[PDB]
Design a binder for this molecule. Structure first.
Ligand SMILES: *[B@]([O])([C][N]C(=O)/C(=N\OC([C])([C])C([O])=O)C1=[C]SC([N])=N1)OP([O])([O])=O
Length: 356
């Protein structure tokens, strides 16, 4: 049975490399605390350098899961309340319209007036402060979900303020060590640049993510397959980890509201398990990702849950999924974007063929 995992990943993931002309891929499965690492192709086309357990990939929006974990850690240490507003920590936002939005609404994209991205012109800290000072509501606060880098970005900045550390240090000095991650970075050091994969755009030109406003909390983390399998292990089996990070992890698993079949947790998307393929595909549909959607209160609190998150930068694709009840999870890292649908479907076939 264990011998089948490589064959399943070869059957379902390997063909995507030829299909989308992806230079390199790392696919990890964790089942009953056993890790399986499958490596394909090249971390660098020009250097002919093979993807391996040292290869560092851009996580894109999977970074939001670390931001969520940092938030849960700060909350359970009493450094913040999710009922708090940003002005309590970022003084220059005190008594401004954005100061009517609480930390949970920022983390779960329900300010009612924040788009996917900051405007291109917003780059400096001053321009970012100005943007939030000038912010005014549109939809009723807490009622509409619009997936937003600025929204969880501001949440990340406030978490960092609450811990009196820059956000990069919150992750690199507190959260990553607590999760036992050896090669996870906001800023990849000189000594690890040799292990940092090139991303490849739709013209197969090498690219890396550029600095941007509140980039670190929104899409700014880089990691290896082993590290991301450790992170999934922590989400499946927190008991081996410190109480503080156990509490932080449990906080990220709590559904806050529904958009039909999708439950918004902290960073994580949550579903009733078993979930149909189309439920998981629907979670990252144009309608859900790009448009505002009126939320409902959770009506059906699922007994048995699964969680996933996609991530993209210009050069990298990420997908992470775990199912506590089956004690299984999967990580996919590519140094070229492939459609979300392909990531979700490949993972669905593999996880459904192992478990039973
Ligand atoms: B996350 O990753 C977010 N994302 C972002 O931001 C981006 N983009 O976006 C889109 C288009 C939507 C995609 O998908 O990709 C970017 C690019 S470059 C950078 N830095 N960033 O989440 P998702 O949804 O993506 O998964």
């Amino acid at each position: 049975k264990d011998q089948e995992i490589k064959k399943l990943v070869d059957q379902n993931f390997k063909p995507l490399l030829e299909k989308y002309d992806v230079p390199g891929m790392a696919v990890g499965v964790i089942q009953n605390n056993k890790k399986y690492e499958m490596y394909y192709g090249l971390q660098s086309v020009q250097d002919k350098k093979a993807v391996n357990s040292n290869t560092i990939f851009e996580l894109g929006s999977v970074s939001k899961l670390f931001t969520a974990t940092a938030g849960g850690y700060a909350k359970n240490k009493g450094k913040i309340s999710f009922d708090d507003t940003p002005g309590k920590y970022w003084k220059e936002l005190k008594n401004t319209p954005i100061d009517q939005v609480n930390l949970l609404q920022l983390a779960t994209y329900t300010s009612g007036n924040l788009a996917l991205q900051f405007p291109d012109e917003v780059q400096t800290d001053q321009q970012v402060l100005t943007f939030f000072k000038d912010w005014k509501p549109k939809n009723p606060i807490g009622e509409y979900r619009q997936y937003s880098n600025p929204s969880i970005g501001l949440f990340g900045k406030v978490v960092a303020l609450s811990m009196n550390k820059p956000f990069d240090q919150v992750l690199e000095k507190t959260i990553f060590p607590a999760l036992g991650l050896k090669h996870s970075y906001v800023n990849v050091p000189k000594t690890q640049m040799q292990n940092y994969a090139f991303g490849y755009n739709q013209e197969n030109q090498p690219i890396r993510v550029n600095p941007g406003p509140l980039d670190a909390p929104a899409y700014g983390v880089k990691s290896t397959l082993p590290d991301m399998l450790s992170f999934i292990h922590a989400n499946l089996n927190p008991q081996k980890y410190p109480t503080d990070i156990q509490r932080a992890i449990n906080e990220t698993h709590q559904g806050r509201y529904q958009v039909n079949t999708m439950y918004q947790a902290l960073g994580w998307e949550e579903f009733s398990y078993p979930a149909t393929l189309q439920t998981l595909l629907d979670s990252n549909s144009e309608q859900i990702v790009m448009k505002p959607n009126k939320v409902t209160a959770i009506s059906k609190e699922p007994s048995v849950k699964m969680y996933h998150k996609t991530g993209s930068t210009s050069g990298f694709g990420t997908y992470v999924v775990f199912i506590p009840k089956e004690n299984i999870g999967l990580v996919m890292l590519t140094n070229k974007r492939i459609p979300n649908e392909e990531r979700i479907k490949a993972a669905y076939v593999v996880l459904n063929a192992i478990k039973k």
